[PDB]
Amino acid sequence: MVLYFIGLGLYDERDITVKGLEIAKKCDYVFAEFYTSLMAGTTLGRIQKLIGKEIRVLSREDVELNFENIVLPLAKENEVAFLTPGDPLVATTHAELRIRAKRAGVESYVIHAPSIYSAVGITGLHIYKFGKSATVAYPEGNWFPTSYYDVIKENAERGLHTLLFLDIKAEKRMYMTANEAMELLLKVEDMKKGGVFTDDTLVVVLARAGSLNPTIRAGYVKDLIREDFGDPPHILIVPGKLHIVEAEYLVEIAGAPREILRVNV
Amino acid sequence: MVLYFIGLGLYDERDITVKGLEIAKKCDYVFAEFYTSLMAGTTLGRIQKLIGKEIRVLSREDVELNFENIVLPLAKENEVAFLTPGDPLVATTHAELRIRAKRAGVESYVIHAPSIYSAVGITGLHIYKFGKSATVAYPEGNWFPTSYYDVIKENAERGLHTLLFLDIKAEKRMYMTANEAMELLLKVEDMKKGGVFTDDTLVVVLARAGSLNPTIRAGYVKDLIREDFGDPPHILIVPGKLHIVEAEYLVEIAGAPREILRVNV
Ligand SMILES: Nc1ncnc2c1ncn2[C@@H]1O[C@H](CSCC[C@H](N)C(=O)O)[C@@H](O)[C@H]1O
Numbered sequence: 001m002v003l004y005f006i007g008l009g010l011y012d013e014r015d016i017t018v019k020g021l022e023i024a025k026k027c028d029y030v031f032a033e034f035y036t037s038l039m040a041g042t043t044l045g046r047i048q049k050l051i052g053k054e055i056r057v058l059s060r061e062d063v064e065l066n067f068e069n070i071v072l073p074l075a076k077e078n079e080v081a082f083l084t085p086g087d088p089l090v091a092t093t094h095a096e097l098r099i100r101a102k103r104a105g106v107e108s109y110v111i112h113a114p115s116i117y118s119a120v121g122i123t124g125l126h127i128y129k130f131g132k133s134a135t136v137a138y139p140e141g142n143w144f145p146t147s148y149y150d151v152i153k154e155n156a157e158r159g160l161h162t163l164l165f166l167d168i169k170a171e172k173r174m175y176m177t178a179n180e181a182m183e184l185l186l187k188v189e190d191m192k193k194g195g196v197f198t199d200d201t202l203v204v205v206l207a208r209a210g211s212l213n214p215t216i217r218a219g220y221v222k223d224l225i226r227e228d229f230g231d232p233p234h235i236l237i238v239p240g241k242l243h244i245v246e247a248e249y250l251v252e253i254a255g256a257p258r259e260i261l262r263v264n265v
Numbered sequence: 266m267v268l269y270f271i272g273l274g275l276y277d278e279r280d281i282t283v284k285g286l287e288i289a290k291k292c293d294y295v296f297a298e299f300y301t302s303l304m305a306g307t308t309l310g311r312i313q314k315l316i317g318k319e320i321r322v323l324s325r326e327d328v329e330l331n332f333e334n335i336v337l338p339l340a341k342e343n344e345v346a347f348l349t350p351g352d353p354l355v356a357t358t359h360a361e362l363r364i365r366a367k368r369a370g371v372e373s374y375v376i377h378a379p380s381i382y383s384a385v386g387i388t389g390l391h392i393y394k395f396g397k398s399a400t401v402a403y404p405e406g407n408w409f410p411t412s413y414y415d416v417i418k419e420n421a422e423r424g425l426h427t428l429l430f431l432d433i434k435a436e437k438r439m440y441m442t443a444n445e446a447m448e449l450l451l452k453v454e455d456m457k458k459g460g461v462f463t464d465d466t467l468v469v470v471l472a473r474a475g476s477l478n479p480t481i482r483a484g485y486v487k488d489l490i491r492e493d494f495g496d497p498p499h500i501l502i503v504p505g506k507l508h509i510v511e512a513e514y515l516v517e518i519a520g521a522p523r524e525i526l527r528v529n530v
Pocket of ligand 1: 275302353355380382433474498
């Protein structure tokens with residue numbers, strides 16, 4: 001009669017909360033999805049070993065089209081868990097699944113976990129200064145989406161930071177790198193000429209948040225565009241004007257050039 | 266030779282990540298602060314029991330004025346942890362403590378935990394649509410803070426949602442309720458008269474996120490301003506223009522008036 005939405009956290013199998021782990025262990029059935037994002041620091045096998053239960057992986061179609069036929073029937077008569085990377089319901093489509101549960105007469109509860117949305121706090125940028133967020137999507141064929149560029153423009157215009165989620169082909173386990181994202185933005189700039197993203201733009205790269213050894217780097221596009229930030233996932237941030245405290249953290253912790261202390265504050 | 270900043274999560278001792286717990290258990294010394302937020306579902310005793318170590322609680326003064334005298338000295342020759350509610354670097358000034366660690370020759374690492382900043386996803390509002398955030402502070406003396414009102418105005422004009430952290434006076438055991446926040450906002454409205462926050466404004470209240478049964482309510486200020494949302498902590502949200510799916514969730518899960526289903530495109 002109960003369905004638990006449980007977040008797995010940021011990077012590896014230990015990023016699930018103690019609460020999430022203990023609940024998952026007591027569930028009769030455990031499902032999971034790895035299409036909204038991936039857990040780059042672990043494997044399905046290691047997650048299963050930790051929970052001590054077999055985990056049935058569900059595809060985007062399994063969930064979006066058949067959640068009520070695959071998960072809910074069992075949840076109607078058993079304790080069922082649905083694991084998701086990060087924090088449950090951060091992904092836009094997940095919230096609606098709680099309505100499906102209600103419709104099916106199944107109670108649902110949410111067990112939170114760390115999300116990259118809040119983990120960016122490790123960049124030293126004040127969380128309250130982050131504005132609207134966006135996703136940089138790989139262009140393909142004759143389709144060249146650029147709305148994320150406008151998001152940066154609108155946030156920066158108001159002195160706000162912009163969190164940019166990078167494209168991920170979960171199924172093929174292919175991650176867009178911060179370098180590729182920078183190249184794309186420069187490409188968009190060359191087309192819109194809005195003066196939003198150039199070689200002189202200050203950016204922050206956060207790779208493998210959740211790991212004990214994440215890569216946190218800050219600097220100008222011209223210098224970071226070909227830098228190796230390590231293994232994915234990568235997150236790109238275009239900060240707005242900086243509070244001196246933010247700038248000093250970027251210099252001391254993220255290796256930012258001293259120049260930001262006078263140019264970006 | 267190391268200092269770990271470890272988040273404890275939203276509501277109780279089990280909201281810590283497994284990673285955080287396993288590291289905390291092996292630390293030589295464990296410190297913590299409980300003034301940045303309120304964990305309404307646990308006690309110091311229960312936290313100490315789970316970690317299996319004595320925890321020295323620090324006051325805001327101990328941290329802000331003497332972190333480098335109380336914590337860092339021991340971190341030079343031992344493995345030390347500093348625990349905080351939620352995520353240690355979200356809506357706190359703790360990021361700066363990493364700079365103090367560096368100058369003291371102490372390596373620091375961050376272990377994230379669920380944060381209210383991302384937990385708001387449980388309200389059904391799309392996380393990417395949240396704009397700049399703000400804090401509703403208790404007026405004191407002749408000083409009546411109002412900057413949060415302008416944040417709401419700015420986000421709303423862009424169609425973005427506004428997350429409002431609520432004030433907390435840990436030493437006085439005072440935790441601002443959503444009701445008190447709405448009352449303060451109505452007063453600022455009368456002063457500035459910008460048509461930003463009135464009795465007809467739709468708001469969302471999330472109380473005790475992290476618990477299994479948090480209070481999630483949506484409705485007009487005139488109807489919710491005197492409603493009992495249960496024990497603190499509380500957070501208030503002022504949505505911008507809603508997507509149809511957001512409205513459906515607010516109606517089905519947060520008990521909002523079904524009239525909001527009729528979005529004005
Ligand atoms: N479980 C919870 N439910 C509702 N609001 C919460 C909450 N935890 C924190 N808050 C809100 O956030 C304020 C503290 S701000 C510090 C937040 C913390 N670092 C985090 O990551 O969550 C509180 O006064 C309250 O308004």
